[PDB]
């Protein structure tokens, strides 16, 4: 299937638009086993993305979740 799992702002935005997610929830969507990225590279690019998006922060189950869900 031309044109897989890559850490992009587009992907993060789509996940956060669907539902609030913690940092751990998001990291689970971009597993190193699929990207081949080291844990450090993964944390670094996700940080840049989350910084730019600056998602709303909601407390759910006593835990801060990022959210672009209105």
């Amino acid at each position: 299937g031309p044109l897989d799992v890559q850490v992009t702002e587009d992907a993060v935005r789509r996940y956060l638009t669907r539902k609030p997610m913690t940092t751990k929830d998001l990291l689970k969507k971009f597993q190193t086993k699929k990207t081949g990225l080291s844990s450090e590279q993964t944390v670094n690019v996700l940080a840049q993305i989350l910084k730019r998006l600056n998602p709303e922060r909601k407390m759910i189950n006593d835990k801060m979740h990022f959210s672009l869900k209105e």
Binding site: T22, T23, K24, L27, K28, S39, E40, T42, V43, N44, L46, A47, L50, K51
Partner: peptide, 18 residues
């Protein structure tokens, strides 16, 4: 877990780390 470590590292990174 490793996910837990990465999450702390990400959250700490958001505090303007590396």
């Amino acid at each position: 877990s490793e996910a837990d470590e990465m999450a702390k590292a990400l959250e700490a990174e958001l505090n303007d780390l590396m």
